[PDB]
Amino acid sequence: EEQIAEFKEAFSLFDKDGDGTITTKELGTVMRSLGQNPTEAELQDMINEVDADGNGTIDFPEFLTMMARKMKDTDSEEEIREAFRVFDKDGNGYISAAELRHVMTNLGEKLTDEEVDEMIREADIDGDGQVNYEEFVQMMTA
Amino acid sequence: EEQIAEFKEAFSLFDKDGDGTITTKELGTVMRSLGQNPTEAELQDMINEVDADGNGTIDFPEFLTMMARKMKDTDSEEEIREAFRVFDKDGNGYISAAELRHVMTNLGEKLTDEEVDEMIREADIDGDGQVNYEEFVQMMTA
Amino acid sequence: CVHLNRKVFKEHPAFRLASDGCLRALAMEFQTVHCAPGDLIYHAGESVDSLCFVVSGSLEVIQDDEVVAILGKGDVFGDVFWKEATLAQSCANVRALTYCDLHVIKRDALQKVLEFYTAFSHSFSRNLILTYNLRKRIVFRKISDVKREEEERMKRLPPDHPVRRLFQRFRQQ
Amino acid sequence: CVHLNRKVFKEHPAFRLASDGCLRALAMEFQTVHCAPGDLIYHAGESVDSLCFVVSGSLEVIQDDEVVAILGKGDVFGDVFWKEATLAQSCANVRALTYCDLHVIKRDALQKVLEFYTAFSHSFSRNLILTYNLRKRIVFRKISDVKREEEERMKRLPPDHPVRRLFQRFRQQ
Amino acid sequence: NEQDKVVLFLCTFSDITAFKQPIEDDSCKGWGKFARLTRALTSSRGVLQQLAPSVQKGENVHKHSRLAEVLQLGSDILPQYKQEAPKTPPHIILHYCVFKTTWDWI
């Protein structure tokens, strides 16, 4: 999620030329400096088992799929994050009152404008019209 | 009532010479500048239907009768204004305690001097011995 | 402070029974107040929270443009605090005739001293007659208005329904 | 102080019934406040403990980046204290347009004066209409957001179980 | 705005009551309805359009005068709602100006 850009230093530390192309020779070099001696055959098996393109070179959003695989968050954390994904359609980290109006139309339960503004304002704490992930969980707690 | 003197600018704006004499020719001129073209016959009908003197010229207290006709105030406002007219005999906008003594004699229910002074003082707020229209309605409310 | 308020404490019969410690506890809360001529002390409707001892000069008490009491040297006005136990509005203006020296004492401070000196408080209540109660309303009539009303009395249900109601309210008062 | 706050006491219909003693007791607790342009008075969510009389200049009331009321000469804003009897947060910022002179009065001092002058307090409640209640929230919609939502409405139970619960909470609200 | 975005609607009001027609649902008189219309249309006729009612055919002239005040204002009062610096008319130099300060120094 937010550590996706924090992995970018590690991903630039992966390749030796820094080309966005995960070489087999560069991976063998970094494992050899790690202290393991793997064969190139099992490293090619790892390439064909990891890469979605699968051409001897992989990218950083091509690793984002494996990052989403190895993420594996909790129960309630994934619940509120998926509720953020369906509840914010733009995914911009904020809940506009018009976004809550659109998901009130898409929920089936239609609410008034005063009630939807009161739901925003009870949800909001800093008071800028949009609520945060923390402001979302602050009412999803109890 | 209080707008009677505020109509005096309009009444001086009615006549052209400003003589206290509503001319038929001046009324035809001001309607012609208004954008209507009435005949002088219907304007003479309006003169004979409006003026209490009825001589081709009318005055400002001669219009005060039509102003009292077209006043047509509310129920409770006219009630408290007529209660002011019977309750203040001088009509001076104030209720002296001796005025309340005279209307206590003319009401039939005679009260003591201490009770009539207490009625004045409970009625009065600014405390000058006389009460106002607003001080009258302030106890006539509830 | 006892020497400053000796002009109260030697002249008043309420204070001729005061203990020495009670005299200290009173004089530390007294305030000497000088007033100019025409510089009034209490407005009409002002809160009377301080009974004042006029130790010098003369004062007049104007209720409804009429002088009601002249206060001279050694006269106590204000409100009887220990018996009233509530704040009231002043009935009358208290204009100052001359350069006067009063010795006021606030209601809260006087009540503190009288609650602490319980044996003195009964003597104070029995011996301090207020010269003019500023709380109580004095009913009267002006002679000019009585004369004009006699002239008018020699000259002289649709209104009563929004009027007798109020009258009955005043009967319930 | 009555002469300093004559700009309130001669112009407001709430104060045209005020007694002389009540006028003194109000003006001793009034505070004239000068503000610079762009120097706002109440924040969003600040406690509104002081109703202000704008005796000079002009103010704007910004709720959610939108001007909601322009206050001019002789306009009263704040919160209706004697009827609310509780402190509330301000709904909106109150930015100052020009160099303005307000005449504020704190809620506690105004409540003291209105509790002591009981005959005046009813007249104050009947004659002081607040120009802008800072307590009450004004619901509206922005035209640009309504236009974008109309564009989105032309373009368009596993989530509902942790969501409809909250919805029902809002139904209980 | 200062950013040239529209932010307010100024709508200016006047009365064309006396210059259109009298119409009443109920009245003491047609004369009374005329009196109420003359009491309404005051700020134009009784004040601004005072050279009109002596002359005749003044309806278009009075409407043009009352609208031409606001029409010249449609270019004059474009106050733009900006917290801008107050300015003097030109050919009037400021007191604390840098040129005026170095002029006073020389």
C147 located within any domain: no
Q: What is the resolution of this structure in A?
A: 3.7
CA distances from C30 to B46, C107, D83 (A): 80, 11, 39
- CA B62/CA B57 separation, integer angstroms: 10
Contact C74, C140 (CB under 8 A): no
Residues of B in contact with E60 (CB under 8 A): 35
Spell out where chain A is interrupted, by the residue before each break (C to N > 2.5 A): none
SS3 content of chain C, % helix, strand, coil (to 5): 35, 25, 40
DSSP-derived 3-state class of residue D66: strand
**Contact between C115 and C121 (Cβ < 8 Å):** yes
- The CA distance from B11 to E38, in Å, is 10
Angstrom distance (rounded) from CA B16 to CA E55: 10
Q: How many residues does chain D have?
A: 173
Q: Report yes or no: A137 at the D interface, CB cutoff 8 Å.
A: no
In a domain, C149, yes or no: no
Q: Tell whether domain A4-70 is in CATH 1.10.238.10.
A: yes
Report the CATH number at residue C50.
2.60.120.10
For residue B113, the one-letter residue type is D
Q: CB contact, 8 Å: B88 with chain D?
A: no
Determine the distance in angstroms separating the CA of E69 from the nearest CA of chain B, rounded to an integer.
Answer: 19
Q: Is residue D81 part of a domain?
A: yes
Q: CA D82, D87, D93, D97: dihedral to nearest 10 degrees?
A: 40
Neighbouring chains of B at 3+ CB pairs within 8 Å? C, D, E
Is there a domain that residue D160 lies in?
no
CA angle D1, D3, D7 (to 5 degrees): 110
Q: Is residue D97 part of a domain?
A: yes
Chain D residue numbers with beta carbons less than 8 Å from the beta carbon of A137 are none
> Residue D158 falls within a domain, yes or no?
no
Residue that the structure tokens 């009585």 belong to: C146
Other C-beta atoms closer than 10 Å to the C-beta of B102 total 19
Q: Quick check: C47 and D116 in contact, CB under 8 A?
A: yes
**For residue C61, which amino acid is it?**
V
Residue D120 lies in domain? 1-133
Cross-chain Cβ contact C164/B109 below 8 Å: yes
Q: Answer for the pair A123, A136: CB distance below 8 angstroms, yes or no.
A: yes
Please tell me the total count of domains within chain D. 1
B105 to chain C, any CB pair closer than 8 A? The answer is yes
Contacts of C52 (CB under 8 A, 6+ apart): C33, C41, C76, C77, C78, C102, C103, C104, C105
Q: Is B14 on the interface with E (CB under 8 A)?
A: yes
Whether the CB-CB separation of E82 and E2 falls below 8 Å is answered with yes
Strand order in the sheet with D100-106: D31-35, D100-106, D50-56, D75-78, D132-133
Choose the closest CB to B109 out of C141, C148, C167: C167
3-state secondary structure of E74: helix
Q: What are the φ/ψ torsions at residue A24 (nearest 5 degrees)? A: -75, -35
Q: Are strands D132-133 and D50-56 parallel, antiparallel or unpaired?
A: unpaired
> Hey, how many other C-beta atoms are within 10 angstroms of the C-beta on A82?
14
In this complex, the residue of E7, E8, E83 whose CB is nearest that of residue D37 is E83
Q: For residue A60, what are its two tokens?
A: 């950083």
